Amino acid sequence: SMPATVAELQAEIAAWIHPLNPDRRPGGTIAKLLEEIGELIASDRAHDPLEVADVLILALDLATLLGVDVTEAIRAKLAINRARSWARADNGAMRHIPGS
Amino acid sequence: PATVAELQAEIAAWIHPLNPDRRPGGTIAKLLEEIGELIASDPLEVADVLILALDLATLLGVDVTEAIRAKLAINRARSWARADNGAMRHIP
Amino acid sequence: PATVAELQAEIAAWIHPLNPDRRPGGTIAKLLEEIGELIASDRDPLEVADVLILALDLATLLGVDVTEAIRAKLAINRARSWARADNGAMRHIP
Amino acid sequence: PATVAELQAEIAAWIHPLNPDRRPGGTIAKLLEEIGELIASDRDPLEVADVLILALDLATLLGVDVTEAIRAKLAINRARSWARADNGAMRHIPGSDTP
Ligand SMILES: Nc1nc2c(ncn2[C@H]2C[C@H](O)[C@@H](COP(=O)(O)OP(=O)(O)O)O2)c(=O)[nH]1
Ligand SMILES: Nc1nc2c(ncn2[C@H]2C[C@H](O)[C@@H](COP(=O)(O)OP(=O)(O)O)O2)c(=O)[nH]1
Ligand SMILES: Nc1nc2c(ncn2[C@H]2C[C@H](O)[C@@H](COP(=O)(O)OP(=O)(O)O)O2)c(=O)[nH]1
Ligand SMILES: Nc1nc2c(ncn2[C@H]2C[C@H](O)[C@@H](COP(=O)(O)OP(=O)(O)O)O2)c(=O)[nH]1
Ligand SMILES: [Mn+2]
Ligand SMILES: [Mn+2]
Ligand SMILES: [Mn+2]
Ligand SMILES: [Mn+2]
Ligand SMILES: [Mn+2]
Ligand SMILES: [Mn+2]
Ligand SMILES: [Mn+2]
Ligand SMILES: [Mn+2]
Ligand SMILES: [Mn+2]
Ligand SMILES: [Mn+2]
Ligand SMILES: [Mn+2]
Ligand SMILES: [Mn+2]
């Protein structure tokens, strides 16, 4: 499929990792995710799709381990984000402004 | 279930008007904040991490399906050892 | 001059009244936020300060003698062999 | 207890022969690896040591006087007001600087 559904990508990731690390857990997955984000930061390569892939392989598989429906969770939080008020943070991302 | 590209389009359509000069560096900064929240904590928190990780791919122009499949093909040909943190490291 | 233990004491004296039940998990979470800010910065001693304030306080919360722990791990590191990793740091050879 | 500058000097004297052209980017990358190890630990001082070795060497590479920088930021933090965040740490209240 092209583009694949996020669940199909999770399944392809899991088909690779499950024979090798069937009882992997969220904590070790987050630890590896931080390693791979580090590699992306340090990457001198103007384009590094394989380092982005490492980050996404772990983030999508984290969702699998936590039983999270990626489509439902992302759309539910985007709906929350649309209803929120926002201000820019110094790092260039945003932070929401509390209502009640 | 949505395609990864459709979720990228929905994320970008929300953040782009609010943050028109968003960059990979600030996206990575925020991603690290949200991973911290997950450590300290949960589907909506996982959502925060994925919203930022997928938008980083958008900003870097990475075809997610193609890149993940390419790296999984590399990972299949590698041999692996279990790391102390419970994840793996490939054997050089 | 002030030692790492004295900086830990100064940090603890500031944060403890504000966050009397602070714990390693939230401190690691805040440390990740501040490393992110350092990454995104376009400059930055005060962002480095934010990282070190949290990392030194993490050692305090975990009961770690910073001088002795650093010197003990450096001694382990001297006994290892090292390869250059793609990110520009090193990884020891098993 | 050693001064932070002395610990930085010992760290630098160890790593510089092995990695003389090391940079902040790779040091941050490794720092994140070692923080991850602390998160996943089912235990420890040597893991805390890995984090601090890299965070202090980062300060060296960026030319930061650690004692001066930490004291300057603590002074700023004392003048701020603070709210507790959901992760258990604090975030300063915007606009609350005591003048
Ligand atoms: N892609 C993208 N998402 C962003 C950016 N700034 C904030 N966000 C989103 C990511 C998360 O879904 C959400 C986090 O909101 P925030 O105020 O920390 O609140 P919280 O939801 O973590 O409690 O905001 C940004 O610059 N880019
Ligand atoms: N989902 C998942 N992926 C894992 C785990 N351990 C390793 N991986 C994958 C994520 C990346 O695609 C890859 C990283 O390999 P590694 O030996 O650091 O090498 P590198 O490819 O970063 O150079 O391995 C793990 O425990 N879970
Ligand atoms: N300052 C500095 N320290 C470095 C660098 N590359 C590796 N190190 C040190 C930091 C830690 O004390 C140690 C981490 O070793 P590693 O092979 O991951 O093994 P481990 O000790 O985490 O099991 O190596 C580097 O580039 N700079
Ligand atoms: N040790 C410790 N320090 C904390 C905690 N919560 C916040 N801080 C400190 C660390 C940094 O010096 C500072 C971060 O402040 P913040 O409101 O993100 O603002 P900023 O200084 O990053 O702009 O606050 C906390 O729970 N523990
Ligand atoms: Mn990688
Ligand atoms: Mn790696
Ligand atoms: Mn790499
Ligand atoms: Mn969040
Ligand atoms: Mn947040
Ligand atoms: Mn949260
Ligand atoms: Mn901050
Ligand atoms: Mn900042
Ligand atoms: Mn800061
Ligand atoms: Mn370590
Ligand atoms: Mn390590
Ligand atoms: Mn370890």
Numbering used by the authors:
A (entry chain C): 0 to 99
B (entry chain D): 2 to 42, 47 to 97
C (entry chain B): 2 to 44, 47 to 97
D (entry chain A): 2 to 44, 47 to 102
How does the study describe this entry?
Cyanophage S-2L is known to profoundly alter the biophysical properties of its DNA by replacing all adenines (A) with 2-aminoadenines (Z), which still pair with thymines but with a triple hydrogen bond. It was recently demonstrated that a homologue of adenylosuccinate synthetase (PurZ) and a dATP triphosphohydrolase (DatZ) are two important pieces of the metabolism of 2-aminoadenine, participating in the synthesis of ZTGC-DNA. We now propose a complete 2-aminoadenine metabolic pathway for cyanophage S-2L and related Siphoviridae and Podoviridae phages. The post-infection composition of cellular dNTP pool is heavily altered: dATP is eliminated and replaced by dZTP, which is created in turn from dGTP.
Purified MazZ of cyanophage S-2L is capable of removing two terminal phosphates from a nucleoside triphosphate. Its preferential substrates, dGTP and GTP, are rapidly dephosphorylated to dGMP and GMP, respectively. We obtained crystals of MazZ and solved its structure, bound to the dephosphorylation product of dGTP and catalytic Mn2+ ions, at 1.43 Å resolution. Contrary to other members of the all-α NTP-PPase superfamily, each MazZ protein chain has two additional β-strands at its C-terminus. Together, they form a homotetramer with a typical MazG-HisE fold: to our knowledge, it is the first time that the fold is recognized as identical for all MazG, MazG-like and HisE enzymes, despite the number of determined structures. The whole MazZ tetramer constitutes the asymmetric unit. The dGDP intermediate observed in crystallo is almost completely buried inside the enzyme, except for the solvent-exposed β-phosphate next to which we found three catalytic Mn2+ ions. The closest residue to guanine’s O6 is N20, through its amide nitrogen at 3.2 Å; the 2-amino group is only 3.0 Å away from the carboxyl group of D60. Altogether, the specificity of MazZ emerges from the cavity volume matching guanine’s shape and its charge compatibility. Ion A is coordinated by residues E34, E35 and E38; ion B by E50 and D53; and ion C by E38 and E50.
